[PDB]
Coordinates of C-alpha atoms in Angstrom, one line a residue:
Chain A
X1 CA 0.0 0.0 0.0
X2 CA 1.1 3.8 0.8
X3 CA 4.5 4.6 -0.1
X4 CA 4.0 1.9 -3.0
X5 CA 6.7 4.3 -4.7
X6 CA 9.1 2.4 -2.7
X7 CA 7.8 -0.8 -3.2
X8 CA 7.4 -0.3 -7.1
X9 CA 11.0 -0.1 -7.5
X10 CA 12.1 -2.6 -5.1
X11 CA 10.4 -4.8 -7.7
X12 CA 11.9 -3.3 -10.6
X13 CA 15.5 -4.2 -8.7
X14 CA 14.7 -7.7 -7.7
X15 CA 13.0 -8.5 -11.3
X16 CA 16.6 -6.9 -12.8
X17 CA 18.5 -9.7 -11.1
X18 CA 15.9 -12.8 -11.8
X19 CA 16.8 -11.7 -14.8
X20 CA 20.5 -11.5 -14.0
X21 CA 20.3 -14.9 -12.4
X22 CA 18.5 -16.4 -15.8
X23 CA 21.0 -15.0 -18.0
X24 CA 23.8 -16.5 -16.2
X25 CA 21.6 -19.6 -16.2
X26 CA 21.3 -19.5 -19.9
X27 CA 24.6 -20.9 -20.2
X28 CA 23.9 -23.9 -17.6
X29 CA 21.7 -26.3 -17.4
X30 CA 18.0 -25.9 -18.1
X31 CA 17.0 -29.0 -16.2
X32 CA 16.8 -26.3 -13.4
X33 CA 15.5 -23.7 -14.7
X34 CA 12.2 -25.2 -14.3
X35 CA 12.9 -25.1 -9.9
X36 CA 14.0 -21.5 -10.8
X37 CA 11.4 -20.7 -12.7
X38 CA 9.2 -21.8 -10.0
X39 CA 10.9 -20.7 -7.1
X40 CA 10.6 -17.0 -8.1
X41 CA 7.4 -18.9 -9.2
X42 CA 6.6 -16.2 -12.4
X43 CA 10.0 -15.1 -13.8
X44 CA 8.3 -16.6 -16.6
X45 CA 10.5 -14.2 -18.8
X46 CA 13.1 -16.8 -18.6
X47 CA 11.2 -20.4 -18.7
X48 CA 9.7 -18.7 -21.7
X49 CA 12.9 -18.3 -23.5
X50 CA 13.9 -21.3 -22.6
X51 CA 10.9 -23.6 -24.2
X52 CA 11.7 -21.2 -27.2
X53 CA 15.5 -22.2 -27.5
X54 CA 14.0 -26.1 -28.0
X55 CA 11.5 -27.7 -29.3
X56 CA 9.7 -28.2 -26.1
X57 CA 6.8 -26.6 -27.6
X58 CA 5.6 -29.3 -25.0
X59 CA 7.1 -27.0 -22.2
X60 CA 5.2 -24.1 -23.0
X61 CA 1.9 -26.0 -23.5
X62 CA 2.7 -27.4 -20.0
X63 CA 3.4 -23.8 -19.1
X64 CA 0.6 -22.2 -19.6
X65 CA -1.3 -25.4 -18.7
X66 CA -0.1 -24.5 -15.2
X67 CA -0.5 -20.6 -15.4
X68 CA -2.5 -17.7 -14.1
X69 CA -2.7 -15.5 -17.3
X70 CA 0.2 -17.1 -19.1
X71 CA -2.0 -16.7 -22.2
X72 CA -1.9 -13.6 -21.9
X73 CA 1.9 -12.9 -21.6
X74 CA 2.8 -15.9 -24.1
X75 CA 1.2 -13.6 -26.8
X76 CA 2.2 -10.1 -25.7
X77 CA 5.4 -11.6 -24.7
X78 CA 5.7 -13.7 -28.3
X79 CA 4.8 -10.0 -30.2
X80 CA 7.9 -8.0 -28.1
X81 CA 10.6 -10.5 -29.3
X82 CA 11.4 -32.8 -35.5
X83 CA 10.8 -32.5 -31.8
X84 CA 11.1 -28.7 -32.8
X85 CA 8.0 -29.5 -34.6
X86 CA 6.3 -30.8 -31.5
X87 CA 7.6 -27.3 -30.3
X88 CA 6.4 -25.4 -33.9
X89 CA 2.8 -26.9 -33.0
X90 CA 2.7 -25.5 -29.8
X91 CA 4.5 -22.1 -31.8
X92 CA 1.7 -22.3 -34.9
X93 CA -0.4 -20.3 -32.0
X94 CA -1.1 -17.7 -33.2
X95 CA -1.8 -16.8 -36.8
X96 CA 0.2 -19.4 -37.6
X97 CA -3.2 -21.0 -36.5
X98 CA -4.8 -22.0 -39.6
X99 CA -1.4 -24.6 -40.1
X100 CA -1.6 -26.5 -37.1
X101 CA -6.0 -26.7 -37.2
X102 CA -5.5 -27.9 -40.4
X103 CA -3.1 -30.7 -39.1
X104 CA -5.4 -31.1 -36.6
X105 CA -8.2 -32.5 -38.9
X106 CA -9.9 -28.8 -37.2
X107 CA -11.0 -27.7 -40.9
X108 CA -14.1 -25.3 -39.6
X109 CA -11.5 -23.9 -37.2
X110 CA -9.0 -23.4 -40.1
X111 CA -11.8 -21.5 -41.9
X112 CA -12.6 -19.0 -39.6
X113 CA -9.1 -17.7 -39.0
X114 CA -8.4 -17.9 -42.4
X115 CA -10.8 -15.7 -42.9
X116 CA -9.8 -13.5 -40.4
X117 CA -6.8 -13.2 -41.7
X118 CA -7.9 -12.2 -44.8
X119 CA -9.3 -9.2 -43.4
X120 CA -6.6 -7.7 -41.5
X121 CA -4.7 -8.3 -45.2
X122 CA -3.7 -5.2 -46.6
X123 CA -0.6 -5.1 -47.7
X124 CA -0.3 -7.8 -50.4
X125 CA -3.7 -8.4 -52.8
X126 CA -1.9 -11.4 -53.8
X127 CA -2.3 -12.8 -50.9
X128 CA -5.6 -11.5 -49.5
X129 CA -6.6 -13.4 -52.6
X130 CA -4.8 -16.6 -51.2
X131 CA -6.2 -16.6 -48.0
X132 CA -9.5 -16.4 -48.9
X133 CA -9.3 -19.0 -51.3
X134 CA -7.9 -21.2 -48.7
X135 CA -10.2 -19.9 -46.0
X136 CA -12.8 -21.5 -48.9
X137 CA -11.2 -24.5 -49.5
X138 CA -10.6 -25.1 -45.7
X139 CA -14.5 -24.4 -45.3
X140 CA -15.6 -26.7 -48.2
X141 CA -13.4 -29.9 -47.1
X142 CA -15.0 -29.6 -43.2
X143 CA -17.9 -30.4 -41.8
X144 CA -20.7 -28.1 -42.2
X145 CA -24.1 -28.6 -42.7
X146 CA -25.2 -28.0 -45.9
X147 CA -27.3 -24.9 -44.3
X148 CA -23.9 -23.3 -42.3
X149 CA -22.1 -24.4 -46.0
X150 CA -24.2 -22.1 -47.6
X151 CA -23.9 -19.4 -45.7
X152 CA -20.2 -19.6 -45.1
X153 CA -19.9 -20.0 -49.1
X154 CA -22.3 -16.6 -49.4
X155 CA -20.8 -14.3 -46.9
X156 CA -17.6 -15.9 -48.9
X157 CA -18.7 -14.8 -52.3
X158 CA -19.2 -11.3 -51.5
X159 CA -15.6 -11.2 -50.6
X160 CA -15.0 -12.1 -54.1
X161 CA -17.1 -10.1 -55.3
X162 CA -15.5 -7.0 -53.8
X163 CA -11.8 -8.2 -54.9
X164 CA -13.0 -9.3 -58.3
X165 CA -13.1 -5.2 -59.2
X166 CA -9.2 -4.4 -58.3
X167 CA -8.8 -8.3 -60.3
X168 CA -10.1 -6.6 -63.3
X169 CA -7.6 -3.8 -63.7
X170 CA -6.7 -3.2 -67.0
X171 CA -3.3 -4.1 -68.0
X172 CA -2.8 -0.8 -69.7
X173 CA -2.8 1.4 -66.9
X174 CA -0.9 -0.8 -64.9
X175 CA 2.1 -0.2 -67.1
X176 CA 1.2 3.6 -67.4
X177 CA 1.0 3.8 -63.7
X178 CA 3.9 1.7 -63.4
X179 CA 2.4 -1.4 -60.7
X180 CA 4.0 -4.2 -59.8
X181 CA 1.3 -6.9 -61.1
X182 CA 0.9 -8.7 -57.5
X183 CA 3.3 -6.9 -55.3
X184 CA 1.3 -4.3 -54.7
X185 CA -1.3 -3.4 -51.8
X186 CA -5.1 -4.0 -51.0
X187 CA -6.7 -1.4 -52.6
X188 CA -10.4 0.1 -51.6
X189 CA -13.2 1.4 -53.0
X190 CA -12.1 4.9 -54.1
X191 CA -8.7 4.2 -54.9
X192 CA -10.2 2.2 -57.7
X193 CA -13.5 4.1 -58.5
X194 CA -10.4 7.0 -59.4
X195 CA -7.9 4.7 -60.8
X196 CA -10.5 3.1 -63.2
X197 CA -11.6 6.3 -64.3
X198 CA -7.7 7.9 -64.6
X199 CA -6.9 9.6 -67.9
X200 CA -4.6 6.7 -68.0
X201 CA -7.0 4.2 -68.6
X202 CA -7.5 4.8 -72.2
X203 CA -9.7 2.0 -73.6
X204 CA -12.5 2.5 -70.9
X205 CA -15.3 1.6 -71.9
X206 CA -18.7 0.3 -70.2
X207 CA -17.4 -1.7 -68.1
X208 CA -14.9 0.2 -66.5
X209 CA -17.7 2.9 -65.1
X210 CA -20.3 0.0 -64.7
X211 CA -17.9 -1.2 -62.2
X212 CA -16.5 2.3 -61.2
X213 CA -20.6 2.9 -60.3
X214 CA -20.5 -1.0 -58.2
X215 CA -17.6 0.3 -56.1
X216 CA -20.0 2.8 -54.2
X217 CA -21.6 0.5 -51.8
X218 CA -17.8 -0.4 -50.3
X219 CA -17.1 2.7 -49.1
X220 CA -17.7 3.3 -45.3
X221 CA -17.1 11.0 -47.5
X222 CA -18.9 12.8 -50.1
X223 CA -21.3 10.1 -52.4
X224 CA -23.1 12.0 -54.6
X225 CA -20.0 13.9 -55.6
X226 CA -18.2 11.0 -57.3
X227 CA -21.6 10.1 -58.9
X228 CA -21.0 13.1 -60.9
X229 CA -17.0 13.2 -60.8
X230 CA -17.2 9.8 -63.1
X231 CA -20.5 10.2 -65.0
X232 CA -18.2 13.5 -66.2
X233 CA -15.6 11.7 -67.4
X234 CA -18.3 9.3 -69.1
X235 CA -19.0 12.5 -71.3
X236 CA -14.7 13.6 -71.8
X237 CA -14.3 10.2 -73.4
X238 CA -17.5 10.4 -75.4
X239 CA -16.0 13.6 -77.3
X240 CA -19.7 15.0 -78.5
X241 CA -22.2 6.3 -77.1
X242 CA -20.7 5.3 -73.6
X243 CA -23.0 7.3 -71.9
X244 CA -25.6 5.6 -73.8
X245 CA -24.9 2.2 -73.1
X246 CA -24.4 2.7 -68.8
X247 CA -27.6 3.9 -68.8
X248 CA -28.5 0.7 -70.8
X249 CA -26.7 -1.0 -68.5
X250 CA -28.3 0.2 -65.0
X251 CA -31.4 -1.8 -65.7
X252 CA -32.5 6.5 -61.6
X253 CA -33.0 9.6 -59.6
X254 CA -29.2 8.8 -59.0
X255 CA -27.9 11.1 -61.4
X256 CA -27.7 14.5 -61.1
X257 CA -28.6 17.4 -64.2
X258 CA -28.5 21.3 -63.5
X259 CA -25.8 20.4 -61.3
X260 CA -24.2 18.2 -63.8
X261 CA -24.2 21.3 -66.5
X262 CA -21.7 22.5 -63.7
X263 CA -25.6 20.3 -73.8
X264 CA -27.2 19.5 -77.1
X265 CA -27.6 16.2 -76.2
X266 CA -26.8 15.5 -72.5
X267 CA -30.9 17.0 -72.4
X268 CA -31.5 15.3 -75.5
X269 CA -30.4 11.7 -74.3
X270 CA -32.1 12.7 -70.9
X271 CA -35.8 12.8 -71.9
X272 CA -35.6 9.3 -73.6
X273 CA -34.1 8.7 -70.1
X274 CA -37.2 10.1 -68.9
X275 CA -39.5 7.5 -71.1
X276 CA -36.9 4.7 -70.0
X277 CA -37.4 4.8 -66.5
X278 CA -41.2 5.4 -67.2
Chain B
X1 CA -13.1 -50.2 -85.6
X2 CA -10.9 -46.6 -86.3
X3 CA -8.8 -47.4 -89.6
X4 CA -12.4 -48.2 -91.0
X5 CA -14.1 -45.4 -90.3
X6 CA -10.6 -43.2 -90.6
X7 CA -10.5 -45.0 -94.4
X8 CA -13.3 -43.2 -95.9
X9 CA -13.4 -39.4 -95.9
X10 CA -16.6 -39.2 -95.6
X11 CA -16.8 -40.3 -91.9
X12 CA -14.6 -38.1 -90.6
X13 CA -16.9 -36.6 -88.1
X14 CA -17.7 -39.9 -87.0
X15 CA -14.4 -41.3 -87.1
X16 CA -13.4 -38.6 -84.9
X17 CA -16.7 -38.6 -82.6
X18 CA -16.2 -42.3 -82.4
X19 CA -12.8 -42.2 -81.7
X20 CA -13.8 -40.0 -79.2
X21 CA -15.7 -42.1 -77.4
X22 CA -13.0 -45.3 -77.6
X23 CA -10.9 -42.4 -75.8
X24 CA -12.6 -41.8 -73.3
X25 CA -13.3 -45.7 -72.2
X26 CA -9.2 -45.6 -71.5
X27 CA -8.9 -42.7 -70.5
X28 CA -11.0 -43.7 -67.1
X29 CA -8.4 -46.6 -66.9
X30 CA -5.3 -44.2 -67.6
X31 CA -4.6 -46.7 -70.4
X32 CA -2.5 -43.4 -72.0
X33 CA -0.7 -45.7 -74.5
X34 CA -4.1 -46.9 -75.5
X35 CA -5.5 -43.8 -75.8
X36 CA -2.8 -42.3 -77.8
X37 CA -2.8 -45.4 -80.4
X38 CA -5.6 -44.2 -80.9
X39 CA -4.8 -40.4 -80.9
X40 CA -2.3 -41.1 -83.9
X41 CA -5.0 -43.2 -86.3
X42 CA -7.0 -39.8 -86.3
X43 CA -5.3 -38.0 -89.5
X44 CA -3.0 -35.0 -88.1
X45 CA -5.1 -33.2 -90.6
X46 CA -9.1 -34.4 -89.5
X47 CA -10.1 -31.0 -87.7
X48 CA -9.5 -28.9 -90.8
X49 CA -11.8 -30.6 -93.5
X50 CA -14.5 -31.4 -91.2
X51 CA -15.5 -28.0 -91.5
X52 CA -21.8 -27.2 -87.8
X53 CA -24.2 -29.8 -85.5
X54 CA -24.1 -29.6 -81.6
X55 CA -22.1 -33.2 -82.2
X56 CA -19.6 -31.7 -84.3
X57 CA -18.5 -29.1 -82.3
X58 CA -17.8 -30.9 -79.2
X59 CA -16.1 -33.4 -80.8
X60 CA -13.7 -31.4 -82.1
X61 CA -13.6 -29.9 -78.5
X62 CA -13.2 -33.0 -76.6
X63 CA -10.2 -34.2 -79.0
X64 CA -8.4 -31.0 -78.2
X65 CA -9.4 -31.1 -74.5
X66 CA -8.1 -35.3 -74.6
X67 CA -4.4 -33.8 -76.2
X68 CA -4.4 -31.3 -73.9
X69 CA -4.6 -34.3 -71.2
X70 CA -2.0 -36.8 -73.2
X71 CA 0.2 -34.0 -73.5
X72 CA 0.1 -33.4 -69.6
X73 CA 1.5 -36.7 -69.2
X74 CA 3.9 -37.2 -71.8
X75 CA 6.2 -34.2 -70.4
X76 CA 5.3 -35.2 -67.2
X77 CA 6.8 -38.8 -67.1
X78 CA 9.7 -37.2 -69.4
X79 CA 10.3 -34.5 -66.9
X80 CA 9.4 -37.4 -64.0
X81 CA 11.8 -39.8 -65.7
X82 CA 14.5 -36.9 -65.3
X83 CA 14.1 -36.2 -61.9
X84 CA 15.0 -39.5 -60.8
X85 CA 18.7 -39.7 -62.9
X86 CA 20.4 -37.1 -60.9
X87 CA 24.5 -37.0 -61.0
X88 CA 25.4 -38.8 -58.0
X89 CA 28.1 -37.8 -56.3
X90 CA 31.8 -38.6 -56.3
X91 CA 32.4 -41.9 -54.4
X92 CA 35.2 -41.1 -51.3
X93 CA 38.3 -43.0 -50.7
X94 CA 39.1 -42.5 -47.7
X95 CA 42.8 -42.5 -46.6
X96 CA 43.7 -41.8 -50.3
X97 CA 46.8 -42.1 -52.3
X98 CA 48.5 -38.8 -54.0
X99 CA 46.8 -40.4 -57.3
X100 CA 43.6 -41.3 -55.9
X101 CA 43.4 -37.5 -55.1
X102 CA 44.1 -36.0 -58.1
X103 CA 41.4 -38.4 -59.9
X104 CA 39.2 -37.2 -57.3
X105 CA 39.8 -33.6 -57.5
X106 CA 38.7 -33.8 -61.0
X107 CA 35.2 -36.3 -60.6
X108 CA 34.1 -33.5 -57.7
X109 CA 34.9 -30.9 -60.6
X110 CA 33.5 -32.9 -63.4
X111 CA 30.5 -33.7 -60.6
X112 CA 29.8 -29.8 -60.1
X113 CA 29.1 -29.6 -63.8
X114 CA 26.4 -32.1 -64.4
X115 CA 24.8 -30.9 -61.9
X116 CA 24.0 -27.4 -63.0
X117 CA 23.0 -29.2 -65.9
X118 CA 20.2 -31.3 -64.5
X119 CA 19.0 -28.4 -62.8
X120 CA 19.6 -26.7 -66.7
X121 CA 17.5 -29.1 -68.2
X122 CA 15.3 -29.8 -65.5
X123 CA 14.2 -26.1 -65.3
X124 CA 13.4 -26.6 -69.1
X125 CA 11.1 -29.8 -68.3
X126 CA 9.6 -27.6 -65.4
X127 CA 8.5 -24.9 -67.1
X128 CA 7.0 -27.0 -70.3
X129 CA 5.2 -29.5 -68.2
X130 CA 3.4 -26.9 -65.8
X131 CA 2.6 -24.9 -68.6
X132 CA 0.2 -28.3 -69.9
X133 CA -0.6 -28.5 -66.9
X134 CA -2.8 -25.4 -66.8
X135 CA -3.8 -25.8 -70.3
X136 CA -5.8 -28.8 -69.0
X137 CA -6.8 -27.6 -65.2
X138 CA -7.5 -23.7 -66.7
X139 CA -8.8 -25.0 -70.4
X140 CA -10.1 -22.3 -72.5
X141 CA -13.3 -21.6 -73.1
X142 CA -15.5 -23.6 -70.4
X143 CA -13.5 -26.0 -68.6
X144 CA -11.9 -29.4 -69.4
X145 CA -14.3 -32.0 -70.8
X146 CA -17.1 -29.6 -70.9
X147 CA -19.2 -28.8 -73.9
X148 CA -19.3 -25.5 -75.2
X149 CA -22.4 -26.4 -77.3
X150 CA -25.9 -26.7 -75.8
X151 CA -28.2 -28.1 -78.5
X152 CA -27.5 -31.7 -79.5
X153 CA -29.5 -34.6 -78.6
X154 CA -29.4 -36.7 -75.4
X155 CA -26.2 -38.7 -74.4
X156 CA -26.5 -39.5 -70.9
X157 CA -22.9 -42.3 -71.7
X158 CA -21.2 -39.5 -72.6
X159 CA -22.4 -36.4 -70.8
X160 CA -22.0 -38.8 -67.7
X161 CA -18.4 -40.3 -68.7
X162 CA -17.5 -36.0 -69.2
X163 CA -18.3 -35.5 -65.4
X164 CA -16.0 -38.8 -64.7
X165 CA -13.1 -37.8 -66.3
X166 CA -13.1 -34.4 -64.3
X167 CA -13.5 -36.2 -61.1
X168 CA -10.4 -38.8 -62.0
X169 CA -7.9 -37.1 -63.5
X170 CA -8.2 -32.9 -62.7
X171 CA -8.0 -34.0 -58.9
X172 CA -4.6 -36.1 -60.3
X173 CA -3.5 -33.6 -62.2
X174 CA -3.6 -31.0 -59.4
X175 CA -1.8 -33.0 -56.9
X176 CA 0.9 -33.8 -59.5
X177 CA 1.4 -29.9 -60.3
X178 CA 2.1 -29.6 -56.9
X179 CA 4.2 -32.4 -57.2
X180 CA 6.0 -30.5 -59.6
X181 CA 6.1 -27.1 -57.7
X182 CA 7.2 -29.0 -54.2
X183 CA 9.8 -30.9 -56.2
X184 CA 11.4 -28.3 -57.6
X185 CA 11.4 -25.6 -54.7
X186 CA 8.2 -23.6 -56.4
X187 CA 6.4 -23.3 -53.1
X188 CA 5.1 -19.5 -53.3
X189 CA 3.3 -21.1 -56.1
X190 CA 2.1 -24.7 -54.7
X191 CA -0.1 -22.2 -52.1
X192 CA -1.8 -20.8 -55.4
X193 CA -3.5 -23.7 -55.9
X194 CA -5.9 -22.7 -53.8
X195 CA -6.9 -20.0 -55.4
X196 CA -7.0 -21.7 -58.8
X197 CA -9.0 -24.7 -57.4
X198 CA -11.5 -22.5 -55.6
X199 CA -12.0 -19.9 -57.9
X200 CA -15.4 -19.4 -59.3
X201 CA -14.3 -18.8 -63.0
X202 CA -13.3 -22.8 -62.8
X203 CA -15.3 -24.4 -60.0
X204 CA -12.5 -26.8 -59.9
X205 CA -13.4 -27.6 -56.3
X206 CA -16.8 -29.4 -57.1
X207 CA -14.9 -32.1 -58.6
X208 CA -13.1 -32.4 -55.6
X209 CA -14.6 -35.1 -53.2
X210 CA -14.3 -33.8 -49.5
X211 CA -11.6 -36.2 -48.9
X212 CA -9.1 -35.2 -51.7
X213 CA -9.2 -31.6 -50.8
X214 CA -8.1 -32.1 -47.1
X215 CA -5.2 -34.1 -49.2
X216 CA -4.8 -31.2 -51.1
X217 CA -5.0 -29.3 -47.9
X218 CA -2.2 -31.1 -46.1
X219 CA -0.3 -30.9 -49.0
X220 CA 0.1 -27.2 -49.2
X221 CA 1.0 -27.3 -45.7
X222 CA 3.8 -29.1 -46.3
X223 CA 5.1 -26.1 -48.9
X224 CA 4.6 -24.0 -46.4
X225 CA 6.5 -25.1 -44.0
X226 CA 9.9 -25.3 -46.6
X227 CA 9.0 -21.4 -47.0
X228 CA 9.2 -20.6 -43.3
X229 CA 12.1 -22.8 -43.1
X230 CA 13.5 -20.2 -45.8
X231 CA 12.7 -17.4 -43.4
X232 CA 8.9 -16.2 -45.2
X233 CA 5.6 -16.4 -44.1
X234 CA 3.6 -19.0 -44.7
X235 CA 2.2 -17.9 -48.3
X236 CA 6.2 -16.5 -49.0
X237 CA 5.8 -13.1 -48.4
X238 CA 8.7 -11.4 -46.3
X239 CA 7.6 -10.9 -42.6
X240 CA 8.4 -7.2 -42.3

């Protein structure tokens, strides 16, 4: 209690020679570094840099088997830093989850960090894309009922769905804009709503704004100005046919007009846009 | 029954169609020689005079899609045939004489040749059978053994011997590609089955039983662990 100052860093000085006594112990014999371990029963600091030196991936599994909050400090303590494959499946906690479930015959498990995995992923598209797939193929070989199947294979597709757009990108742009084909990052929504709309992309053509107009529900700012920023650039590449064919495509209110002007035939192409919709 | 119906000109569409089907009795029994007997009987020449019914088309389809399969195993068991004929090393004498030495100075020399060499070669027979590989499990247009055309007449024997051959031989022909990849150190790429087996543009993974994907499965998991062995993530991307 009061004066805990005092008794904060009389901690801090016995914890810096535990620590002084496991480092000279490094050398020695481990065989007692368990009856060290547990005589300053926590300086787990040192045990857990031991069963890390082996393959005793058995040791830290009988660790933390006998543990108050090991867990805990096995992770945060895992993040600071054969039989060695006994040690590696102990070790494949974390992340490297997905390797040891699937050696585990623990597919459904397998699926759902896959997944989870594949979320977090943003700094390699190639392999978001590779997770997934996995995540899938983990999913499909387990044991779901055909209901849970279907949904996992659903919520599943979307993903796909959503990736499918950046899988798409031209491969003239993406020599203009100088990207490395698969080395490069996850991108989102806007990043391709503006990249397949760039003056780079030459050849655009319906398909590019169909899909730079299916980007807008995977976005999480301003809406209804991009609406016009690309249906504006449907017009530059037109040089008054595209324009035509989107709107042949959509099938309304979504589009803009008097703000749009800020013209022979944007009005004249919007009153048989008038007896479309009606 | 082929040389007969090969003889006259005039069958051609049903030489082929017919030869066809012969093909596809074997194929389910991997007789490979048998099917490519066969394969040689049908003029190099058939596909350009024939020229459309819904029987003609797929027939011309299923023959390129069954070359596309032969081919897949003829580099394969040149390329397999290779990998097992590896220089062996120099035998050791130990405790050797000043001319059992020099000898030996020369078959380690001679040694460190050949075997940049079969790795020469071998790179070459690696890079021409995957390629056939994914001509068969990727085939253009629709998939392996699928028709393309809709509108011919009923043929449960064959429609039914089409979905057979995908379930034999594209779940072989996967785990041999990775066979390939894993043997030859390609282990970035052995992962990316998974995405090529999955993927919706193929469906490959329906013609997976649930068995032979958890093979697949545990099979990937064994590239993996050679690329964190090599210091990479699981997948082969640098842990920054």
């Amino acid at each position: 209690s009061n004066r805990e100052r005092y008794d904060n860093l009389e901690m801090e000085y016995l914890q810096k020679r535990s620590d002084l006594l496991s480092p000279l112990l490094s050398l020695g014999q481990y065989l007692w570094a368990a009856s060290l371990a547990e005589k300053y029963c926590d300086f787990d600091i040192l045990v857990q840099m031991c069963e890390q030196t082996d393959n005793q991936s058995r040791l830290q599994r009988y660790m933390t088997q006998f543990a108050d909050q090991n867990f805990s400090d096995f992770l945060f303590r895992w993040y600071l830093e054969q039989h060695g494959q006994l040690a590696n499946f102990l070790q494949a906690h974390e992340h490297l989850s997905w390797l040891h479930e699937i050696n585990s015959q623990e597919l459904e498990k397998a699926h759902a960090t896959l997944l989870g995995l594949a979320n977090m992923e943003t700094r390699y598209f190639a392999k978001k894309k590779t997770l997934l797939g996995l995540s899938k193929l983990a999913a499909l070989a387990s044991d779901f009922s055909e209901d849970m199947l279907q949904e996992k294979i659903e919520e599943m597709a979307e993903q796909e769905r959503f990736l499918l757009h950046q899988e798409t990108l031209p491969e003239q742009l993406l020599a203009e804009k100088q990207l490395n084909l698969s080395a490069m990052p996850v991108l989102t929504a806007p990043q391709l709503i503006g990249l397949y709309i760039c003056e780079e992309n030459r050849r655009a053509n319906e398909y590019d704004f169909k899909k730079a107009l299916d980007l807008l529900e995977y976005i999480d700012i301003n809406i209804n100005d991009l609406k016009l920023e690309i249906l504006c650039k449907a017009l530059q590449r037109d040089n008054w046919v595209s324009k035509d064919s989107i709107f042949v495509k959509i099938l309304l209110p979504e589009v803009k007009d008097l703000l749009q002007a800020d013209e022979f035939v944007l009005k004249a192409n919007y009153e048989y846009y008038v007896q479309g919709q009606i | 029954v082929i040389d007969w119906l090969v003889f006259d000109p005039a069958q051609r569409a049903e030489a082929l169609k017919q030869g066809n089907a012969i093909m596809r009795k074997f194929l389910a029994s991997k007789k490979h020689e048998a099917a490519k007997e066969v394969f040689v009987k049908i003029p190099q020449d058939s596909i350009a005079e024939i020229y459309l019914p819904a029987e003609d088309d797929n027939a011309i389809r299923e023959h390129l899609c069954i070359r596309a399969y032969l081919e897949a195993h003829e580099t394969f068991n040149e390329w397999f045939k290779h990998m097992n004929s590896v220089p062996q090393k120099p035998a050791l004498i130990p405790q050797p004489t000043f001319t059992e030495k020099v000898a030996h100075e020369h078959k380690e020399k001679k040694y460190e040749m050949d075997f940049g060499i079969w790795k020469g070669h071998l790179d070459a027979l690696t890079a021409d059978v995957k390629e056939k590989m994914y001509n068969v499990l990727l085939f253009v247009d629709g998939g392996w053994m699928v028709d393309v055309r809709e509108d011919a007449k009923e043929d449960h024997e064959r429609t039914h011997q089409m979905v057979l051959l995908r379930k034999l031989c594209l779940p072989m022909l996967c785990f041999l590609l990775h066979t390939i990849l894993h043997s030859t150190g390609q282990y970035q790429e052995c992962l990316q089955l998974a995405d090529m087996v999955s993927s919706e543009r193929h469906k490959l993974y329906l013609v997976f039983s649930k068995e032979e994907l958890r093979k697949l499965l545990q099979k990937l998991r064994e590239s993996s662990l050679m690329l964190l062995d090599q210091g990479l993530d699981p997948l082969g991307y640098e842990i920054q």
